[PDB]
Design a protein around this ligand. Structure first.
Ligand SMILES: *[B]([O])([O])[C][N]C(=O)C1=C(O[C][C])[C]=[C]C2=C1[C]=[C][C]=[C]2
Length: 263
């Protein structure tokens, strides 16, 4: 069946010229709204949530892990490292790397999280351990953002990512302290105001992680606390046919606005 909301998302997609994927979980009743919910999309930096969560899980049995120093060398810098560059020839703790990766989308920080987990497959392994059979991380930064159409590397589906974000931020995939820490990091994100958040009523609060890559890939995954109702989990993925396409955060805001108006 096709709902009014799905029809509106299709119209938005048609006018955008790209491919849009949406997955909403409304925890007020556990219902879901999906648009291309089972198609694969390149995650780009939204994958950093899985990596930070995997490290949080390891910290449940190692009380001092988050305070563990990790060396940052000149050779570790990649294409975007706003936080890590300040620490070259120095160190960053795993908590500092997680916060930098999540709140500023630092790529060097993400690579340190991936390394701590034993490589991209370590992130995938954690996803499997928490019930996500779809997610796959195959490469490090910055190549995991190539976002080539048809390429299965570093992809997931909106349905799977929404389910996983719910389990991580509202459920019990992580211990209570770690869940709280992940939510605190997401709510402190600095990069999301033009994405999902721009399509929501101003009174609502939320935590999110954005993603950007080639083929104008523009992503955002969010946990949302609407005014007067149970939380929502929303994933909005968008990718375009040309490698050098421009970013379209407004399309994500438009998708979020349609979802909100459909409540
Ligand atoms: B994540 O998606 O925020 C990290 N993204 C990238 O490193 C990246 C961007 O985003 C600027 C931070 C734009 C275009 C790219 C990127 C990586 C590889 C190819 C193209």
């Amino acid at each position: 069946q096709t709902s009014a909301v799905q029809q509106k998302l299709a119209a938005l997609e048609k006018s955008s010229g790209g491919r849009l994927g949406v997955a909403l979980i409304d925890t007020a009743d556990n219902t879901q709204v999906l648009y291309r919910g089972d198609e694969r999309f390149p995650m780009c930096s939204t994958s950093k949530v899985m990596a930070a969560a995997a490290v949080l899980k390891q910290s449940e049995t190692q009380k001092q892990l988050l305070n563990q120093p990790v060396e940052i060398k000149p050779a570790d810098l990649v294409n975007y490292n706003p936080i890590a560059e300040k620490h070259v020839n120095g160190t960053m703790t795993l908590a500092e790397l997680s916060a930098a990766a999540l709140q500023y989308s630092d790529n060097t920080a993400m690579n340190k999280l991936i390394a701590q987990l034993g490589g991209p497959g370590g992130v995938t392994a954690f996803a499997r351990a928490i019930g996500d059979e779809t997610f796959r991380l195959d490469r490090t930064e910055p190549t995991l953002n190539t976002a080539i159409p048809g390429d299965p590397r570093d992809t997931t589906t909106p349905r799977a990512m929404a389910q996983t974000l719910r389990q991580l931020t509202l459920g019990h995939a992580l211990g209570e302290t770690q869940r709280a820490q992940l939510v605190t990091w997401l709510k402190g994100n600095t990069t999301g105001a033009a994405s999902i958040r721009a399509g929501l009523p101003t009174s609502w609060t939320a935590g999110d992680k954005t993603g950007s890559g080639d083929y104008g890939t523009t992503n955002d995954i969010a946990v949302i606390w609407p005014q007067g109702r149970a939380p929502l989990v929303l994933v909005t993925y968008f990718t375009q046919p040309q490698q050098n396409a421009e970013s379209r955060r407004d399309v994500l805001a438009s998708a979020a606005r349609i979802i909100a108006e459909g409540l």
